[PDB]
């Protein structure tokens, strides 16, 4: 369902770019095209695809005219632009090397900290497109506010992610703190935002229905981030497209949280000695310790429980939305 729509979705990118690209600003405009091609393409498009898939499922085919669809995939691309924005900036703050199987944009020769302006340009495009295509829709302001509220929450999440991981400083790494981080940093924008966008486009804007969708989608977001933490250490970089940094960057990863919960006092010291340091020998020691306490299998356990819990939540809260809206998304993770 996602898999079949992916093609139409990716083709519509060329138009996004033509519409986004005053002879005086020529060069700046050419640099925008380059920023977009490099940073908006190459991912799985889960998030933007979710807008289009959920739109199809919530609007009657008789209301799905050609113009109506154009807008659904534009808002789909706005969500991808948000993602591209957050990624370019997070890679600098995380000192990451690769993203989506290539060098991070800031690590390119001749880019560096200019990437900061590039990232924000990507964010400015969302609102240019919203104006271009939705300025006369009755949901226009709802969408604008949704995308803004979603950036604020996710920047709040980052702050928490950064404050909990000072460079060159474990008591801090609790369950309560972790859940809080992943809720703000990932769950609102990766999960609530795309479904809610499609809800407002389908004329569904009751508070109750948004909160019920939210209940489902925040929990899916939390699982997704825990998966992200797992793959940071135990995923194949040939598949993920990115090299992990979590132990080096002293992060409140799900892995470190579970570990702590499990560790003999001596094991606690091994972690204390080695965590949050750039030395490959010390990172390997931490990885060995995670393997010593079967955290890959604890992760496979958690993944199953949480999937059951998400399914229970869909059964409780999907009505009156088609459950397929949610099942389709959960199956893709």
Binding residues for Mg(2+): 90, 94
Binding residues for dimethylallyl diphosphate: 99, 185-186, 225, 242, 251
Are 272 and 170 contacting, i.e. CB atoms less than 8 angstroms apart?
yes
Examine the residue annotation and report whether 228 is marked as an active-site residue of this protein: yes
* Chain position carrying tokens 């060159």: 168
Report the 10 Å Cβ neighbour count for 168: 7
Binding mask 94-113 for Mg ion (x = CB under 5 A): x-------------------
Examine the residue annotation and report whether 90 is marked as an active-site residue of this protein: yes
Determine which one of 71, 99, 183, 214 is catalytic.
Answer: 99
Cβ nearer to ligand N1Z, comparing 86 with 133 = 86
Span near its own copies by CB under 8 A; candidates 53-61, 87-95, 197-205, 317-325: 87-95
For CA atoms 159, 162, 165, 169, the dihedral sign is negative
Report the 10 Å Cβ neighbour count for 279: 10
Residue 103, helix vs strand vs coil: strand
Determine which one of 91, 94, 118, 249 is catalytic.
Answer: 94
Positions 113 through 172 that interact with ligand N1Z (CB under 6 A): 117, 120, 154-155, 158
Examine the residue annotation and report whether 131 is marked as an active-site residue of this protein: no
- What DSSP line would sit under 30-60, residue for residue? HHHHHHHHHHTSSS--HHHHHHHHHHHHHS-
Asked if 114 touches its own copies (CB under 8 A), the answer is yes
Asked if 80 touches ligand N1Z (CB under 6 A), the answer is no
Report the 10 Å Cβ neighbour count for 46: 20
Determine which one of 6, 31, 56, 90 is catalytic.
Answer: 90
Cβ nearer to Mg ion, comparing 137 with 158 = 158
Phi-psi label, residue 287: left if phi above 0, alpha if psi -120 to 50, beta otherwise: alpha
Shortest distance, CB of residue 39 to ligand N1Z, whole angstroms? 13
For 312, half-sphere exposure in the C-beta direction (CA atoms, 13 angstrom radius) is: 7
List of residues contacting Mg ion (CB under 5 A): 90, 94, 228, 232
Q: So which residues are the catalytic ones?
A: 44, 85, 90, 94, 99, 161, 185, 224, 228-229
């Amino acid at each position: 369902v996602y898999a079949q729509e992916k093609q139409d979705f990716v083709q519509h990118f060329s138009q996004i770019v033509r519409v986004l690209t005053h002879p005086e600003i020529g060069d700046a405009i050419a640099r925008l095209k380059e920023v977009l091609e490099y940073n908006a393409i190459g991912g799985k498009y889960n998030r933007g695809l979710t807008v289009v898939v959920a739109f199809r499922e919530l609007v009657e085919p008789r209301k799905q005219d050609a113009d109506s669809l154009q807008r659904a995939w534009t808002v789909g691309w706005c969500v991808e632009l948000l993602q591209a924005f957050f990624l370019v900036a997070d890679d600098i703050m995380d000192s990451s090397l690769t993203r989506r199987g290539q060098i991070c944009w800031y690590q390119k020769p001749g880019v560096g900290l200019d990437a900061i302006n590039d990232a924000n340009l990507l964010e400015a495009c969302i609102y240019r497109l919203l104006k271009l295509y939705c300025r006369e829709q009755p949901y226009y302001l709802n969408l604008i506010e949704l995308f803004l509220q979603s950036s604020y929450q996710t920047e709040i999440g980052q702050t928490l992610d950064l404050l909990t991981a000072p460079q060159g400083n474990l008591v801090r790494f609790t369950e309560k703190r972790y859940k809080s981080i992943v809720k703000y940093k990932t769950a609102f924008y990766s999960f609530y935002l795309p479904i809610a966008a499609a809800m407002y486009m389908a004329g569904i804007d009751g508070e109750k229905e948004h909160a019920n969708a939210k209940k489902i989608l925040l929990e899916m977001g939390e699982f997704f981030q825990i998966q992200d933490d797992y793959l940071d250490l135990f995923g194949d970089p040939s598949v993920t497209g990115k090299i992990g940094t979590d132990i080096q960057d002293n992060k409140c990863s799900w892995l470190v949280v579970q570990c702590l919960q499990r560790a003999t006092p001596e094991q606690y010291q091994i972690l204390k000695e080695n965590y949050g340091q750039k030395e490959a020998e010390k990172v390997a020691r931490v990885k060995a310790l995670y393997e010593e306490l079967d955290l890959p299998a604890v992760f496979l356990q958690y993944e199953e429980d949480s999937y059951s819990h998400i399914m229970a939540l869909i059964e409780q809260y999907a009505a009156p939305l088609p459950p397929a809206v949610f099942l389709g998304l959960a199956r893709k993770i």
